[PDB]
Design a protein around this ligand. Structure first.
Ligand code: SF4
Lengths: 428, 336
């Protein structure tokens, strides 16, 4: 499309500053802006999810995503570059997260949160302007049903528009419109008596309806995007991109427990071999110690139970307090610059120098032989063709796919902690 | 079961068609029983000879996933026990029947002016209750979540303890205002005079005092039903002087409205309503302990009117009432 056709298209599609993002895009983009825009939108999503995980309230979320709006993704600024930026970034995200149901759920939730924040951000005129372009009840039906709608919506106006004064509520209720829909679509608002109902028709708290409609349409579109994934999978320019963006979003367990089958049943091969070495030799070398320590932190072992277990495995205390206690406490960030060092991933663990005699660290899909790997897989009750598949994955330099392979057959993962997490989630 | 239960009317009611359908083939009878026709219905009921048989949901398979079942409501006097003097224990009369009459009036008002439902009738429970059956297409296939929504819309009284101030949300939701402007005139004539439960001083301190907000006014009234009702306002105006009279008077109005609701508002059954799978005694079943007929309830019906265990028997008027209802239901099904 010529720049005029695309100009008119985005004028029509972004007549309102907000849209449910209904149709596929129209144009071409150089890969650099592809990455910049995807990263901006993903980072803003990550920050919003960080805000919600700690249960921050609405206005503080607005305030904290305001600067990332002002820096990363401009809003309410008429620059057509801003508009196409946002649109393309969103649909790239739809490409990204459509791969798994957990990821689809999180993406739909988070993009609907974006919808929410953008909506409360906008002006009244432009709010209703988006809402216009699902039937608005007539002004006559409004006047006839005036007292009931006033009674219903007065409390919501008080709590949501800080309209403590009654006169302001009357003035805005005069300005407010009302929509008519069967209550089977707003039963959530019905339960709390947030919307008036009449003869099986709900008068809508309209923002919640708009947001959940958007969310459901988003989920359907995202499932469809996953369905059509193989027809883009020939795009060798985007599969690294989509994998990178997908990975971009990534006591019961006690010192005595980590030796129990209920706890080590979920381990990957690396951690199993590290446990085996720690049990056998009653000592590991620096790399195995660090890998295992940060892993056991990632699964959730307490610092005191960590000291307990590590001290137990060495069947003197003097040398411990002399040399190992400080290092172990430094590992948990409880020393020095106070850096709770995030666990090594399969990538960082592979980035470590290769293991030798007395070493057990690394990715055993690399550091072992096909003989030992295959014997261990047979011990895991795997079939023959499964063994050929795992070894074929290994031989191609692809250790992580072999790991996720053995996972799916004993029950994309490049993190032992998320390996354990998914394994436990399957039991929960 | 051999002579008096009108199987044809019930079959045509629950079949949703003149011809037998999966709405009848795949419905549960209590567990997990189903019939294919009027004839097999009669044969199995006669052979089993049950005290009462309960209506299940329509399923995909002959009784297993539930497809449809009519929206239902069950109400029992037990939740109204702390507010009568005419009857004790499990006895009933037209004085305590006014409670169910008012509750059915409120619920029917909601279901008609509010939910668009049209084909709903009330079935007497046999001893002291009334059962609602809403057979419109929308309610029959209503999901569990939306059934929870409709129930939670209908049952404002969620706390069945009579020793606490309700503290309802203010100002009223429009249905609440409608229900109060319906029930308020009746409240005097029933509770203040005919039942008069607050004439007893101990029942008074147990019920009429906890509904108030002010401890000082509570204690003043304690040291000091229509008479007590007026005395509450009198001592309220006596104890609250100054510019702050207005808020106290308004909240006293609201507390009195809350108590009138607590006394005369629908207190349904909350479990017969939730899940579509659930069971309820079929109409025209016989109560094993009393022997009455669970006859359909009209506006003037009273417990003494229900016949005790055919066209010239007292059962016939209820049979014709059910006939008219089922014909209207079938014509509405054709319309849908
Ligand atoms: S691929 Fe990574 S997670 Fe799997 S065993 Fe090797 S190091 Fe552990």
């Amino acid at each position: 499309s010529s720049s005029e056709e695309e100009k008119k298209l985005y004028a029509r599609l972004y007549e309102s500053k907000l849209s449910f993002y209904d149709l596929p895009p129209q144009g071409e983009i150089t890969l650099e802006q592809f990455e910049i825009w995807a990263i901006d939108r993903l980072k803003i999503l990550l920050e919003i999810e960080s805000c919600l995980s700690r249960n921050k309230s609405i206005k503080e979320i607005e305030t904290i995503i305001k600067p990332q709006f002002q820096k990363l993704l401009p809003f309410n600024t008429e620059s057509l570059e801003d508009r196409k930026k946002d649109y393309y970034s969103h649909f790239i995200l739809r490409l990204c997260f459509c791969r798994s149901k957990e990821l689809r759920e999180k993406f739909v939730r988070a993009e609907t949160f974006l919808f929410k924040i953008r909506f409360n951000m906008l002006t009244s005129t432009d709010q209703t302007k988006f809402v216009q372009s699902l039937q608005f009840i007539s002004n006559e039906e409004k006047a006839e049903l005036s007292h009931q709608l006033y009674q219903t919506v007065s409390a919501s106006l008080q709590f949501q528009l800080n309209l403590n004064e009654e006169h302001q509520r009357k003035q805005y209720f005069q300005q407010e419109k009302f929509i008519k829909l069967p209550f089977e679509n707003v039963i959530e608002l019905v339960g709390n008596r947030l919307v008036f109902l009449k003869d099986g028709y709900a008068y809508l708290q309209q923002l919640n309806l708009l947001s959940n409609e958007f969310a459901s349409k988003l989920n359907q579109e995202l499932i469809k995007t996953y369905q059509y994934l193989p027809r883009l999978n020939e795009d060798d320019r985007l599969l690294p991109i989509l994998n990178h963006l997908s990975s971009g979003y990534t006591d019961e367990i006690n010192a005595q427990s980590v030796w129990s089958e209920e706890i080590s049943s979920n381990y990957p091969l690396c951690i199993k071999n590290l446990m085996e070495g720690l049990k056998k030799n009653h000592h590991l070398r620096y790399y195995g110690r660090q890998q295992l320590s940060l892993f056991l932190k990632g699964i959730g072992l307490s610092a005191d139970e960590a000291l307990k277990f590590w001290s137990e495995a060495f069947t003197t205390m003097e040398k411990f307090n002399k040399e190992y206690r400080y290092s172990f406490r430094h590992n948990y960030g409880l020393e020095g610059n106070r850096i709770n060092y995030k666990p090594w991933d399969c990538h960082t663990i592979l980035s470590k120098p290769r293991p030798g005699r007395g070493d057990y660290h690394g990715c055993p899909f690399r550091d072992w032989s096909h003989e030992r790997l295959s014997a261990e897989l047979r011990s895991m009750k795997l079939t023959q063709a499964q063994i050929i598949s795992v070894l074929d994955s290994c031989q191609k330099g692809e250790y992580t796919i072999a790991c996720t392979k053995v996972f799916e057959m004993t029950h994309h993962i490049a993190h032992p902690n998320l390996y354990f997490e998914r394994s436990r989630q399957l039991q929960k | 079961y051999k002579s008096l239960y009108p199987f044809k009317h019930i079959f045509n009611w629950l079949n949703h068609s003149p011809k037998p359908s999966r709405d009848m083939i795949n419905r549960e009878f209590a567990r997990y029983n189903s019939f294919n026709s009027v004839q097999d219905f009669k044969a199995q009921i006669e052979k089993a000879n049950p005290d009462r048989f309960e209506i299940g949901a329509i399923y995909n398979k002959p009784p297993l996933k539930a497809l449809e079942k009519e929206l239902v409501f069950d109400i029992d006097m037990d939740d109204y026990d702390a507010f009568r003097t005419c009857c004790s224990g499990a006895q009933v009369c037209s004085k305590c029947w006014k409670f169910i009459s008012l509750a059915m009036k409120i619920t029917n008002t909601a279901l008609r002016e509010d939910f668009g439902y049209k084909d709903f009738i009330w079935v007497f429970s046999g001893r002291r209750g009334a059962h609602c059956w809403v057979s419109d297409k929308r309610a029959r296939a209503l999901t569990d979540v939306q059934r929870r929504n409709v129930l939670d819309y209908v049952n404002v009284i969620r706390d069945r303890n009579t020793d606490k101030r309700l503290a309802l949300k203010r100002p009223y939701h429009p249905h609440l205002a409608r229900s109060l402007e319906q029930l308020k005139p009746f409240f005097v004539s029933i509770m203040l005079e005919e039942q008069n439960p607050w004439e007893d001083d101990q029942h008074a301190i147990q019920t009429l005092l906890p509904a108030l907000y002010d401890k000082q006014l509570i204690d003043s009234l304690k040291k000091y039903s229509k008479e007590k009702w007026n005395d509450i306002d009198q001592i309220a105006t006596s104890l609250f002087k100054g510019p702050k009279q207005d808020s106290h008077i308004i909240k006293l109005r609201e507390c009195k409205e809350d108590l009138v609701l607590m006394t005369l508002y629908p207190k349904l059954d909350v479990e017969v309503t939730k899940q579509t799978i659930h069971l309820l005694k079929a109409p025209f079943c016989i109560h094993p302990a009393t022997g009455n007929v669970c006859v359909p309830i009209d506006e003037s019906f009273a417990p003494e009117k229900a016949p005790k265990l055919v066209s010239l028997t007292a059962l016939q008027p209820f049979i014709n009432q059910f006939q008219a209802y089922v014909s209207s239901l079938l014509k509405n099904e054709l319309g849908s």
